[PDB]
Design a protein around this ligand. Sequence first.
Ligand code: CLA
Ligand code: CLA
Ligand code: CLA
Ligand code: CLA
Ligand code: CLA
Ligand SMILES: CCCCCCCCCCCCCCCC(=O)OC[C@H](COP(=O)(O)OC[C@@H](O)CO)OC(=O)CCCCCCCCCCCCCCC
Ligand code: HEC
Ligand SMILES: CCCCCCCCCCCCO[C@@H]1O[C@H](CO)[C@@H](O[C@H]2O[C@H](CO)[C@@H](O)[C@H](O)[C@H]2O)[C@H](O)[C@H]1O
Ligand SMILES: CCCCCCCS[C@@H]1O[C@H](CO)[C@@H](O)[C@H](O)[C@H]1O
Ligand SMILES: CCCCCCCS[C@@H]1O[C@H](CO)[C@@H](O)[C@H](O)[C@H]1O
Ligand SMILES: O=C1C=C(Br)C(=O)C=C1Br
Ligand code: OEX
Ligand SMILES: [Ca+2]
Ligand SMILES: [Ca+2]
Ligand SMILES: [Cl-]
Ligand SMILES: [Cl-]
Lengths: 137, 34, 33, 49, 97, 244, 36, 97, 151, 334, 30, 152
Amino acid sequence: AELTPEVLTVPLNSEGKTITLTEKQYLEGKRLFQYACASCHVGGITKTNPSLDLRTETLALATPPRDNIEGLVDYMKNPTTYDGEQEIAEVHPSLRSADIFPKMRNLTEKDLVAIAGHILVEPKILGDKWGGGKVYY
Amino acid sequence: MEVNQLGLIATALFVLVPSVFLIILYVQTESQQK
Amino acid sequence: MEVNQLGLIATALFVLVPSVFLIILYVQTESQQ
Amino acid sequence: LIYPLGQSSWFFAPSFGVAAIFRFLLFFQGFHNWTLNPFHMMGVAGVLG
Amino acid sequence: ELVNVVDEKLGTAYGEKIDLNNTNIAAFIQYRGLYPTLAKLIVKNAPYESVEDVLNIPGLTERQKQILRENLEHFTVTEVETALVEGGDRYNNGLYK
Amino acid sequence: QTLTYDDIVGTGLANKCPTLDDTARGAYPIDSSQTYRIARLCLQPTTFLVKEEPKNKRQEAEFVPTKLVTRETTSLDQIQGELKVNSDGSLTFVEEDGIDFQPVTVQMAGGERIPLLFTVKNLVASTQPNVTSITTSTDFKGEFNVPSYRTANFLDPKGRGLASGYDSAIALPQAKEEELARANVKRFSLTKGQISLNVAKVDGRTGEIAGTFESEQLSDDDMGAHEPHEVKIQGVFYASIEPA
Amino acid sequence: METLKITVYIVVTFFVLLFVFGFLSGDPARNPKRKD
Amino acid sequence: IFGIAFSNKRWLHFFMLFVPVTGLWMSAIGVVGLALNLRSYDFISQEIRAAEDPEFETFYTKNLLLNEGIRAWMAPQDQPHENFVFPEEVLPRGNAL
Amino acid sequence: KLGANVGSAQGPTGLGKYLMRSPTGEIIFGGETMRFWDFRGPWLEPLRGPNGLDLNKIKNDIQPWQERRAAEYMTHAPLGSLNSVGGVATEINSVNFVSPRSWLATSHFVLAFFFLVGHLWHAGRARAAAAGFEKGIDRESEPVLSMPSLD
Amino acid sequence: ANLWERFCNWVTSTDNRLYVGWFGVIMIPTLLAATICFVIAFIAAPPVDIDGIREPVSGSLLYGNNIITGAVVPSSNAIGLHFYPIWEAASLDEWLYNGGPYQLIIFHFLLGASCYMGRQWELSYRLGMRPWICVAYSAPLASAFAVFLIYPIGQGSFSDGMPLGISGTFNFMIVFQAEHNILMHPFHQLGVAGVFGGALFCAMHGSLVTSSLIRETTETESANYGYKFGQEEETYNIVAAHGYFGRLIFQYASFNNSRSLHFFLAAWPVVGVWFAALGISTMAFNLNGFNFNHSVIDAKGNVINTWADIINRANLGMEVMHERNAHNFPLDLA
Amino acid sequence: METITYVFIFACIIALFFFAIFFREPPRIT
Amino acid sequence: IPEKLAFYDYIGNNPAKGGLFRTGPMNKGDGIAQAWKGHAVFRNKEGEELFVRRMPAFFESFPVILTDKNGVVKADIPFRRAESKYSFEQQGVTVSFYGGELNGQTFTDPPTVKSYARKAIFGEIFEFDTETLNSDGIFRTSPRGWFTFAHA
Ligand code: CLA
Ligand code: CLA
Ligand code: CLA
Ligand code: CLA
Ligand code: CLA
Ligand SMILES: CCCCCCCCCCCCCCCC(=O)OC[C@H](COP(=O)(O)OC[C@@H](O)CO)OC(=O)CCCCCCCCCCCCCCC
Ligand code: HEC
Ligand SMILES: CCCCCCCCCCCCO[C@@H]1O[C@H](CO)[C@@H](O[C@H]2O[C@H](CO)[C@@H](O)[C@H](O)[C@H]2O)[C@H](O)[C@H]1O
Ligand SMILES: CCCCCCCS[C@@H]1O[C@H](CO)[C@@H](O)[C@H](O)[C@H]1O
Ligand SMILES: CCCCCCCS[C@@H]1O[C@H](CO)[C@@H](O)[C@H](O)[C@H]1O
Ligand SMILES: O=C1C=C(Br)C(=O)C=C1Br
Ligand code: OEX
Ligand SMILES: [Ca+2]
Ligand SMILES: [Ca+2]
Ligand SMILES: [Cl-]
Ligand SMILES: [Cl-]
């Protein structure tokens, strides 16, 4: 099996446009996700709130939808609760709260796309292991 | 038959403790210089 | 506790039979010239 | 030899490796309760003694 | 006879839909728009005689009411089961991943 | 003269309810047009008594003393709720929240341990009519709920439970199930308790009252495995009443 | 409990003092060869 | 120091052979039993008391719960020929973990 | 935040799921962390009053910076593997972390222990050398041969 | 002739059947106290709420245990590292419910065993011996400190100290493996090399000396009568023993120097057990065994399991089941 | 019965310690 | 189907199910077998035939999992309940017996269906006299097992 262009093709927006990431982008996304996110989201779960995970089906039912690059990039700038009702930048890392989450201070727009692509590609590799928790280790 | 469950150990110890006492005394008698 | 009824006699003979074997041998050693 | 020969196949013999042997230990705890076995306890006494 | 009331509840609509009177709050994540804001309100104002009573929660925005209406088909109500609602279990039932 | 956590920590005072001076023999006026709440109710048990269970079943069973074995972890506190003025002038306290339960284990003579969930959960307690002022003659009497001492996830030593766990005795794979039904099928208790509060001191200026209480409730039934015992709890209480 | 505590404190102090005063009592010289 | 001491050097060195050699031989006998699943797995009196009395707990009953977790969580990948599929809901777990 | 009343929430054992009493009555966090109630830290002390953790402050006064700090510290607990995989022993690879507190504590226990061994080694040798028998027993002057038998 | 001078002479006397000495003055009362409390508790103590969740575990014979299952149960998790002597309890009944006996036993034992080690130094000095037997004993002693004191300190509770019982020991081992992957820790692996190798070299030395005993007895007498206590001549021929073993392997792999040989026999198990003790004492601060979970990955990113991942699955089963009612939050952080 | 049996064996072992120490065959230099 | 043939298809006669200190005859464990109950056939509410996954000899205890003819999981007995999806109550699992004592009978009460499913992990289901010997319900090995152990 290989990490092919098809595996690396993921939804860009809610309208159905796709984008094909490079292998460089995939590697960048894993690195940056570990740098800034894995401390709570290792394996696609959420250690400080296990009710919400990073599975694509969960992201699709979020408000606004988060199962695409634009949704995930927007989340990393201005994160919301699952229903979109509350802005949570004060307790979740984001570009808006880079003053209190200093690891976000040096994340570029390009970095956010790479992190978003990692979150979307990894379940295409790992299946239900992604966001599955210890049952699937 | 619903016999007393301690009957077995009681009979066994009743035989073995004094029998062993006598065997000890007999054997150490035989082994004394002749 | 519902223990095995033969456990007591099993433990008692397990101790007594080899123990008395050793005591018999020890005592007749002491009594030798 | 004897242990796998009593089981379904060679598969359940120890594999020849460090972590493979550790798995063998843990299998024996979970499936056989091997720490409870008085013959293993005598083994421990002989090795530690 | 002696009966496990949780297993029995699994044979009712509680085993098929979100029971507004009993189900732990994490289940509202199954559908768009319910969690956490409406889910908190639903659990806080339980129990309900019928599913439509959820629309009578005071203070709802019009969109909030519309989200409830779109999801009534996924809700049910059964009698409150003490074993499911004590211990704050509707807010945290000891299940994580 | 105001104590801090470090003044208190380890002394046992943290399990003690506030007290009032011997000069607190006043009266707190109730305005039937004003709404009130109890901002803090504290209950400090001083005696646990358990009803003996005799064989004769025609002799009157008595409550006997017990020894507390779970240390200074028994008091209920930070309890609050609405204090209604009823049309007949009585007051009704409706408990809404607080640290309103404590697991407790006491020991009978001879060693039998009695766990109970000492509690006033969902307390509704009312005074006598025509309470124009709360005084040292005011009493509260009411009922509360006693849920199962263990909640539904609790697993017994063989892994059996109600909302989780095995549903059989897995170590006895081919034993007959009928004889183990009471131990295998977990059940969740919910019963009623009763409590009386006797006001003994009142600070009219501050809205504070203190007194003695007696409450009665069932003990732990181990998720239905055995019959509970009847427990009587006596102690002192403190409450601060506020306009709300 | 108070009496038990006082008793144990006295007992412990006694043995600890024995230990310290014992090793102060010319311990290097308590050997079979050179008296230090 | 200890109350007893060796005095015979030949006995001492024979004893050094005897102790580890006998220990290994005993462990071998136990493993021959495990070849047949002839385990010392349980104490029957413990199981009878524990089955009837849900407040009775010992370190022996605690360790069996650990064993039950080991079997359920390790068997699907450790015994792939069995094609075990254990749905999440059947896995034995304590609270939260 | 989801609506639980954390003061009255009974956990599976009967103890408070979030809040309980220390053996001397102070209000403390529940669950296994009941053992850690002596802990004191600047992100937690605003919530503590004379009787311990204050339920009214818990209900009303928890600031976002406290939630942030608690989430940070929970997810940087000093647990990790020798190859610096952060987390519990069953954690998968991803987070490269072993707390400086673990490195500093483990290293200095190892060093302190061997230095106790070194103390015993050198103290026992200095005594034997000062008395003149650090190289062994004089065959012609074996002390025990000049002592009465024990029995 | 003064009483304190006479007393010091009896205490340090080399003629007592059992040596007392100044370490002995602490050792004797502390070990008697620990022994007496242990025996009484093991026989008759009621169940102990080890995990502080009002779920008392029965340890004693009279309360349903046998020799294999019985234990003195660690003190309650509610106590943590707090000092819980008898006079801190409102009653003996409370003291027993909360695991008081455990603290009394382990504290008196650890002090007494430390004094046992100093006593080994002390008598060796009085006998004109070289001093380092006590250094050999420091290996088992450090191991006892590891499981009864250091591990509780690191984890914040004596409820995680090793129980004083046979099945309780196994409980401690299995939970330790779940929480620290001790099997994959190199200090425990050195420990195994220490005790496996100690057992090996024990059998080896025993067999080699026994093999080269000089003929001094007849066919009907035990050969042990060929050695007389205190004889000046060695009783076996180490040149023959070395000639055998040097040919079994090769000449230079074998010891001809008895001093070198016996130093090796001391050092190998002592060093290995030192590392065992340091294993427990550093996993006490959660620096755990190697973690290779999901270390091998194929070209697409599929995890390719290794035997480490199977170990992990077994560890998980231990983790999720242990203390099944004590955890309310998703991470077991101590 | 079991408890009595376990304590009995233990008590015999402790008695054995006493005799093995204080009533040992005395080591003699010959 | 002969009762003797059905009885061989039962794990209580497997010599690898015993214990070193579980003494005596096999009858001391599961009891003195009296009669075949007949073949249990499990079905869900859709009417699909479901098959109980049998216990391998290695396992002292084993979960109850039911699959369709293709090995797809269709029902089970859950441990945790709050996220159960395959419970007998949710899936409407019934059991009908063919042959033996229970021939022609059908059970729909979930606790009863679950009890039969627990026996089906042992293979064919039998009625035992557990009273005559005060049997304890714990499997013991046969002369085949004891012979093999002693002689190895
Ligand atoms: C106190 C801790 C402790 C101790 C001291 C022991 C001690 C022992 N265990 Mg136990 N164990 C424990 C805890 C412990 N165990 C726990 C908690 C569990 C979980 C239940 C286990 C699970 C367990 C299992 C599953 C087994 C043991 C076994 C044993 C015995 C192994 C003996 C041996 O050396 O085989 C080592 C192997 C040999 C001696 C065979 C010959 C080896 C040849 C000579 C090697 C030649 C090598 C050659 C030169 C090439 C080298 C190349 C190099 C590159 C590698 C020994 C009695 C084993 C046993 O009982 O066997 C009967 C066993 O199978 N234990
Ligand atoms: C107090 C001593 C101490 C402590 C707590 C640390 C801690 C740390 N070091 Mg530092 N360092 C030290 C001394 C120490 N170091 C020394 C002496 C050197 C020179 C070699 C260095 C050079 C150094 C470098 C180049 C790096 C670190 C790094 C690190 C970090 C990762 C460590 C790691 O992965 O280890 C891996 C663990 C081992 C290699 C195991 C060591 C086990 C030894 C062999 C045990 C010794 C046993 C005992 C002492 C002797 C027994 C014999 C007996 C007979 C007596 C961690 C914070 C890394 C880092 O992240 O920097 C930012 C890094 O890259 N250190
Ligand atoms: C494991 C602990 C331990 C042991 C067995 C020894 C053993 C020894 N010490 Mg060392 N010592 C130690 C720790 C230890 N020491 C520590 C941590 C320090 C730093 C403070 C010292 C500083 C030290 C000095 C300055 C000297 C010795 C010396 C010696 C040797 C002569 C005996 C003596 O005078 O000891 C004295 C005993 C100690 C200093 C402490 C012993 C501690 C053990 C655990 C007993 C605790 C007893 C205590 C009363 C318990 C209190 C109960 C509590 C509830 C109140 C002997 C080898 C002497 C020597 O000849 O050196 C060449 C000497 O002059 N030691
Ligand atoms: C050698 C004798 C000895 C020693 C060292 C101990 C030690 C201990 N006992 Mg035990 N006890 C003993 C004999 C002893 N006991 C006897 C004979 C009995 C029967 C009466 C008991 C009955 C008993 C009970 C019922 C209990 C204890 C407890 C304790 C522990 C707490 C003690 C304490 O708080 O003291 C405090 C006393 C002091 C601090 C004063 C010491 C004053 C000295 C002179 C000052 C120097 C101290 C400093 C460390 C210097 C040491 C020097 C050294 C380093 C060289 C401690 C382990 C308790 C326990 O186990 O709790 C878990 C407990 O409940 N003991
Ligand atoms: C080849 C030998 C052998 C075998 C395979 C059998 C097989 C059987 N026997 Mg028979 N039996 C035998 C010889 C044998 N027997 C002998 C010699 C006697 C006279 C004592 C009997 C008298 C007998 C009776 C009265 C009964 C049986 C029964 C049975 C059945 C149940 C067995 C059982 O529960 O064992 C249990 C086995 C154990 C508990 C294993 C014990 C392991 C020992 C104790 C270990 C000892 C270790 C040692 C102390 C360590 C030394 C260490 C040192 C070197 C350092 C089974 C078919 C029973 C039956 O069902 O009859 C219808 C029954 O009632 N047998
Ligand atoms: C500070 C004081 C500490 C005192 C504590 C009490 C220590 C007790 C020591 C053992 C006494 C019994 C010895 C009998 C046997 C006896 O008297 O042996 C005496 C024997 C003397 O040896 P010799 O070389 O003189 O024998 C000559 C031979 O040729 C005889 O044929 O010593 C040994 O053989 C050493 C190896 C056995 C060592 C056995 C250690 C046993 C440890 C205990 C194990 C079980 C514990 C059970 C717990 C419930
Ligand atoms: C812990 C301190 C976290 C870190 C570091 C990051 N996230 Fe997170 N995340 C965390 C929580 C508690 C939640 C739920 C918040 C809520 O109340 O809703 C989340 C959620 C997300 C989501 C939404 C998941 C979904 O809709 O199903 C996403 C997409 C997400 N987080 C992404 C993300 C990224 C990219 C991070 C690094 C840059 C990151 N998170 C850090 C906790 C924590
Ligand atoms: C922790 C509390 C204790 C702290 C004590 C600090 C002490 C510092 C000053 C010590 C003074 C020395 O006091 C010391 O003790 C005893 C009793 O007096 C003396 O007396 C001793 O003399 C000889 C010395 O060979 C011994 O054989 C004899 O047994 C004993 O009588 C020592 O010879 C003296 O050196
Ligand atoms: C000589 C040491 C005495 C050891 C036993 C003292 C325990 S006292 C013991 O306690 C039990 C439980 O509380 C009671 O059931 C019993 O009546 C009582 O005798
Ligand atoms: C209660 C459900 C119907 C009755 C039980 C169905 C399983 S069948 C049952 O199993 C027992 C062992 O548990 C045997 O002892 C007994 O002979 C047999 O009738
Ligand atoms: O014990 C031993 C005796 C001799 Br000789 C040798 O050569 C090696 C060892 Br190990
Ligand atoms: O306590 Mn005994 O074990 Ca050490 O981890 Mn946390 O705590 Mn409990 O869990 Mn896992
Ligand atoms: Ca009054
Ligand atoms: Ca019966
Ligand atoms: Cl456990
Ligand atoms: Cl917890």
